[PDB]
């Protein structure tokens, strides 16, 4: 269990903390696990998901579907991929919110400090 006088296990503050977490902190809660391939290459299990990451749905009725991250909706605690969309009966298409933890990243969009993060993490 928690050994610290710092962390609390109280269920209330926990749910307050999640829902009142700001956008910076949400970005970390929106982490996604890395695919068996990307796990190998980088030796890293999971990273905060971000936009343009290609991805694979590992759960739900969309499982086994693939696309690129359309937007990370942090306000929503949700994420949008193209190619995964509901077509409402008015003819229009609508983006389906999916969770990062129910996704696996099959390709990383890398820039300098996304690289330097993969390095900053031991592994």
């Amino acid at each position: 269990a928690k050994q610290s006088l710092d962390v609390s296990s109280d269920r209330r503050k926990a749910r307050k903390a999640y829902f009142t977490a700001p956008s910076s902190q949400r970005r970390v809660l929106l982490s996604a696990p890395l695919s068996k391939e990307l796990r190998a290459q980088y030796g890293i299990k999971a990273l905060p998901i971000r936009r343009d990451d290609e991805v694979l749905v590992v759960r739900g009725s969309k499982k086994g579907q693939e696309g690129k991250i359309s937007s990370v909706y942090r306000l929503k605690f949700a994420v949008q991929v193209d190619k995964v969309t509901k077509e409402k009966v008015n003819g229009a298409s609508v983006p389906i919110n999916l969770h990062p933890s129910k996704l696996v990243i099959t390709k990383l969009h890398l820039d300098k400090d996304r690289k330097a993060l993969i390095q900053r993490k031991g592994g």
Binding site: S9, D10, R11, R12
Partner: protein, 206 residues
């Protein structure tokens, strides 16, 4: 203290064809006219409001305290009690189980686990793994969401890392023979804790 008593409400007196309970001043809001103070009226004060100076801790006689912890130990010898207390000691070589003092130095779980399972504690271990369940009441949001059984009591002489090794296992608890808590000895005031002794511990008892 301030609960239900924050208001100016007076009675209205008799003669308004309305009960004599105190009622709220002013107007312009539904609150006005309503029943005030009192246990019978909504938004009022509770009957005999709870106080902090209620007596919480209870004093026990020391000798009588040790008399309780003593029989609590002796019950851990009785096979039928420990069996009856809901422990899986069905097989196992003998009761008591005393074990190689090398146990006291085991510092890693995967070891300490299979250590117990081989000494014959496996069945009342798996029990506590299968007894975890959602709490019956509203204590669910009071920070007890889960309810499970009691694994075995691993008792030592000196802590060389058995404690950290079993601190993560579901239902096992560890204790020094210098202390020996009755709560752990007779959980629910129920005799027959299944207790795994170290030879160093066991020889210390007298």
């Amino acid at each position: 203290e301030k609960a239900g008593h924050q208001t100016s409400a007076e009675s209205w007196g008799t003669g308004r064809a309305v009960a004599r309970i105190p009622r709220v001043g002013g107007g312009g809001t539904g609150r006005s006219g309503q029943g005030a103070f009192g246990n019978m009226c909504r938004g009022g004060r509770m009957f005999a409001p709870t106080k902090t100076w209620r007596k919480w801790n209870v004093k026990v006689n020391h000798n009588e305290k040790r008399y309780a912890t003593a029989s609590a130990i002796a019950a851990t010898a009785v096979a039928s009690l420990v069996l009856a207390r809901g422990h899986r000691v069905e097989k196992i070589p003998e009761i008591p189980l005393v074990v190689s003092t090398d146990l006291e130095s085991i510092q890693k779980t995967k070891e300490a686990v299979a250590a117990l399972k081989a000494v014959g504690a496996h069945s009342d271990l798996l029990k506590v793994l299968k007894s975890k369940k959602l709490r019956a009441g509203k204590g669910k949001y009071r920070n007890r969401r889960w309810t499970q059984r009691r694994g075995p009591l691993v008792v030592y002489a000196e802590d060389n890392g058995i404690v950290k090794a079993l601190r993560n296992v579901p239902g096992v608890e560890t204790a020094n023979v210098a202390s020996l808590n009755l709560l752990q000895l007779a959980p629910g005031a129920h005799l027959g804790r299944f207790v795994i002794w170290t030879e160093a511990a066991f020889t210390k008892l007298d």
